[PDB]
Amino acid sequence: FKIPIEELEDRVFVNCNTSITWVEGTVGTLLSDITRLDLGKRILDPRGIYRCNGTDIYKDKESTVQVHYRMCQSCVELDPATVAGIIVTDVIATLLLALGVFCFAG
Amino acid sequence: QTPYKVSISGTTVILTCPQYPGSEILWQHNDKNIGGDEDDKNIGSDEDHLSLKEFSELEQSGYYVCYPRGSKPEDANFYLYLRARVCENCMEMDVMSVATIVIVDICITGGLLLLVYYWSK
Amino acid sequence: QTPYKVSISGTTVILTCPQYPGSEILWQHNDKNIGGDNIGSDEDHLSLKEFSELEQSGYYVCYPRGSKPEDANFYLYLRARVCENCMEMDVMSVATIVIVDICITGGLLLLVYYWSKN
Amino acid sequence: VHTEKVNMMSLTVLGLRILLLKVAGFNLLMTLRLWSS
Amino acid sequence: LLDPKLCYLLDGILFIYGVILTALFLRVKF
Amino acid sequence: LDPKLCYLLDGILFIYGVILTALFLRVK
Amino acid sequence: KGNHLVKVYDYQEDGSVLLTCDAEAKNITWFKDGKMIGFLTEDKKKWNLGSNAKDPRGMYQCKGSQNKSKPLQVYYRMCQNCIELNAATISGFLFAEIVSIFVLAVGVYFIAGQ
Amino acid sequence: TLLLQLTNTSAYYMYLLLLLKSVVYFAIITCCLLR
Secondary structure (H helix, E strand, C coil): CCCCCCCCCEECCCCCCEEEEEECCCCCCCCCCCCCCCCCEECCCCCEHHHHHHHCCCCCCCCEEEEEEECCCCCCCCCCHHHHHHHHHHHHHHHHEEEEEEEEHC | CCCCCEEEEECCCEECCCCCCCCCCCCCCCCCCCCCCCCHHEEEEECEEEEECCCCCCCCCCCCCCCCCCCCCCCCCCEEEEECCCCCCEEECHHHHHHHHHHHHHHEEEEEEEHHHHHCC | CCEEEEEEEEEEEEEEEECCCCCCCCCCCCCCCCCCCCCCCCCCCCCCCCCCCCCEEECCEEEEECCCCCCCCCCCEEEECCCCCCCCCCCCHHHHHHHHHHHHHHHHHHHHHHHHHH | CCCHHHHHHHHHHHHHHHHHHHHHHHHHHHHHHHHCC | HHHHHHHHHHHHHHHHHHHHHHHHHHHHHH | HHHHHHHHHHHHHHHHHHHHHHHHHHCC | CCCCCCCECCCCCCEEEEEEEECCCCCCCECCCCCCEEEECCCCCCCEECCCCCCCCCCCECCCCCCCCCCCCCEEECCCCCCCCCCCCHHHHHHHHHHHHHHHHHHHHHHCCC | CHHHHHHHHHHCCCCHHHHHHHHHHHHHHHHHHHC
């Protein structure tokens, strides 16, 4: 038994057959009427541990889904060369500034 | 109850399930058994958790299962549906972390300047 | 060899497929028959003006008239993104402008120093 | 359409600005150390 | 994205630096 | 809005700051 | 069809480009700009190029089991460097350069033996 | 967003250029210092 998940346009839905009882996770923008609940934007990186009850052919069963999307948007691709150069030049510049303030103080 | 942990670093993903530690476990996704067969060397299952490298957006991005031998694949009551935009050599940083590091850098630089000026005496 | 050459400048894209000593050279695009008479089409280039990203990309095959659209030489699979005017700095251009600015600042600053020393 | 490298450029431009600030402060400080003003 | 927030943060830091020092200058000149 | 305005205002603030720095440390 | 079996897969929202050669053989290698570089092992026929940021180019051949496969091409130029040329950016460049030159000239003038 | 990348690249080039200018200024002042 699985929990079907489909993205119509930009929303991740959870509907299996009936209402889904959230137990821990994200319970935010929901168009909960009886069946489908979604969590709004796809880019919003939604997670959570869910549940739904017996379906049409399968009574009294209970299987849980766990959405763990990782559509990172605030998400930076660091280049080792660039970051290394930046940090080493920063420390060199601060040492040079210390040298300059020392030379002025005298 | 015993939630999954998808810990990822760069292009590689570490996926572990604490449902029943201490037993042989083969995790199948999409109606076929993908455990330890040395297939493609991409699935490295050492003791309990299986890792994937060269993750793709389309394939191997779907449901998942945990259960030991004896029990049938259609017995387990857990399913992980993860979609991972797996990226190479990258991380997630909000503005707060950058603000913190910038403020720290400015502060330590000012402190060093004041220290040197004090030593100038 | 046949070095299929594409040069993109501004919002107009022109290209060339050196295989022809002078022929009709019909063009194709995902089984479409782009060209003729509107949509840009030259004797050698295609002058892709107003080149948007999603609506205009894919295969491009240079095959002369009288031949099947399959037994051609090459393709290019042109994918490009045009904002408006912009320009692209290769490392040579940035090195050149940096060197020019070095020359300018060095000369002017040395001259003002010479003037001020007087 | 991806937002993967624009964050990298915005992070490195901050480093460039902080380096410019430090070096300008240094240079001003020494120039004033000399004499005149 | 974070560029607008980062630029405004750095601008705020530099404005704080400007304001404190002009206050100090106004103190000394007075 | 737009980052262009932010950067222009940052440059104006920077030049003002450096000029005031020079004046302050000249007088003091 | 004839002699043309190189299909590039696309319509994925992530930054990756990749090839497919629809040949039925064992260990079909990949040519590149006229000298061989890549090599294929089984269980995959998906000789990825990386990301559409480094602007991949060149003509690629997979050696079909008759003689060869003529290329398609690769050309990706998204934006990478995108300096605007409106009435704002060039004016800002000139203004900043003039201001910096002026400030440094004033400093140098003050510097000269005074 | 495209405009962010546009402005960011322009400004990165601008700030690199400014730092390059300040470097030669430092060279001049340090030549004066040592002499």
